[PDB]
Amino acid sequence: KGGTVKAASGFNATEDAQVLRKAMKGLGTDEDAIIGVLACRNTAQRQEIRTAYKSTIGRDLLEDLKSELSSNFEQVILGMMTPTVLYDVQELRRAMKGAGTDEGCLIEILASRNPEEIRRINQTYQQQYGRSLEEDICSDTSFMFQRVLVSLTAGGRDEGNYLDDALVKQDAQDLYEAGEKRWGTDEVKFLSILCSRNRNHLLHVFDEYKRISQKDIEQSIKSETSGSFEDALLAIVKCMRNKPAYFAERLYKSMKGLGTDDSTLIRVMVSRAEIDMLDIRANFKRLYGKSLYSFIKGDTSGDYRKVLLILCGGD
Amino acid sequence: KGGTVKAASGFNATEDAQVLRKAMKGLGTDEDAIIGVLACRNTAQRQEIRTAYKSTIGRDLLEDLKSELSSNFEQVILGMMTPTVLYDVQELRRAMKGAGTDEGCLIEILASRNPEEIRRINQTYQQQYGRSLEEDICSDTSFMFQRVLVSLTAGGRDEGNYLDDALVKQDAQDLYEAGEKRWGTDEVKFLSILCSRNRNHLLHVFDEYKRISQKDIEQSIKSETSGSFEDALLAIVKCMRNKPAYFAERLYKSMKGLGTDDSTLIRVMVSRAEIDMLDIRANFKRLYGKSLYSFIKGDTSGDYRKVLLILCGGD
Ligand code: NA
Ligand code: NA
């Protein structure tokens, strides 16, 4: 378990900066050298390489990578070079700036990050952009979906693990009676239970719900709700039960079928490589009976593929 | 299931003719009597009432209804009095005579009627007007849309149900590769598959298409085509999968939002009352979470409303 990318042995930031300068200097690029260094260092080490590049090369590593590289390869490398919290912050801003909101990106990040990470994200977003994340969410999404995202962003959830069996039963009972008639869905109920109860409590509510309804909570969420609100509730449930399997499903859906959602593919591979990619891989193979490696290999190409395959770790 | 309007018990054509004559004779009209008779008889019985009116009243029932009644109420009653095939024939001619072609009416009828009905329509159109339906379609529509309508009109479709799994896969595969690039849509492909394959084959192609592309065929039709050609392909797909839901959507779109398309409202309610109105109602409520009855009641008024509500059957 854990991630694929780890801190390098023999790490020499100045030498790595020299390798990267040699790779980019003059016409042409040695992409293999860029990959061979950066995909073999963790995020913290990459920042030390940025620092060493500035002082020993007298140039800006991020500017140089941006100018040298293009398209999806450039996106993966620049994402790799970005500090963890700022990467999340940048991806949320990109999902909202304008436009036709990337609601799936909002859900993926806000449902899956831990409370201290969400706090850091809120803080950094405001510092960087001079606007609150919550305010931007309110302008760019609406209705029940909007209420879910605001709750995740504010941290409207109990962070302890107190278990009252009687309260677990009433929550499950509440969700059951709500499933009784087609007009009877109480989305406010769903929102409140799924966004406010602590993780232990919720894992127990899911077990009790199955017991009294004979249905998994996910089944009823799908039958009873729709749209981005449904997707948001499903992501909270999945991230509570098995976060690596949540990400394995995001990866699958970004590649399977007609077209490729490279922006999601890239973001998940970059953001999870150091955390739980080994787990994501195992869950992917359990769920889909194919390796994640093989999906990446069959759905991408070029240097873009080469670097994704290292973030994947292999097989 | 089936329709709302059925053959009346105790049917006495002469008495009905007397009731209708009394209702119209002299200044003023008893619209409730006209509705109470005609909306409670089926189309075949209405023709027997026309016959009885001629011989026992010595007048022409259709002329008298036309002179007495006006606007949308008159349109529903005269449509009700018209033999099934001639009603279709009249509606197609009305959609084309002149002008700025009612392309939606052409699609609705030609995509939804069964082959023997299309044959009867072609025959009756030529007899009545001295022009072929296909020729009028060619003069009044163009391009790919025109090719679709001509195919539906000629009956260019296999009417058997032979299923070759290998041919189902290649059709789906063909539609997939076509969805790969923005310039890669092969509308000829779409036309040929959707207009020529038999219904069993096609229902299997839709399932396989979803499997290999992860998209419903309707989604790709919308992203890949536009205009009346898109609408025509969507109507063929919907009529293959769930014809009552096709009509429930026509009704919805004729009433929802700004304005009312009474000509479509009337034509669908008249033409489907004896066939599948109970199914249309159920699909309407499933799709829109409101009864069809309530839409009619909230969007029409007067005697026009009264008769539509009986064609709807109620709630
Ligand atoms: Na260069
Ligand atoms: Na009169």
TrEMBL record, chains A, B:
| Gene3D superfamilies from the UniProt entry | Annexin
Keywords of the record, alphabetical order, are: Acetylation, Annexin, Calcium, Calcium/phospholipid-binding, Cytoplasmic vesicle, Membrane, Phosphoprotein, Repeat
Q: Which SMART domains match?
A: ANX
Give this protein's Gene Ontology molecular function annotations. Answer: calcium ion binding; calcium-dependent phospholipid binding
Q: Where is this protein localized, as stated in its record?
A: Zymogen granule membrane
Membrane found in the keyword field: yes
Gene Ontology terms: cellular component = zymogen granule membrane
Pfam families named among the record's database cross-references:
Annexin
The family database entries (InterPro entries) matched by this protein are listed as: Annexin (IPR001464), Annexin_repeat (IPR018502), Annexin_repeat_CS (IPR018252), Annexin_sf (IPR037104), ANX4 (IPR002391)
**What membrane topology is annotated for this entry?**
Peripheral membrane protein
Domain description: A pair of annexin repeats may form one binding site for calcium and phospholipid.
Give the family, as the similarity comment puts it.
Belongs to the annexin family.
The protein depicted here goes by the name: Annexin
* Gene source species: Rattus norvegicus (Rat)
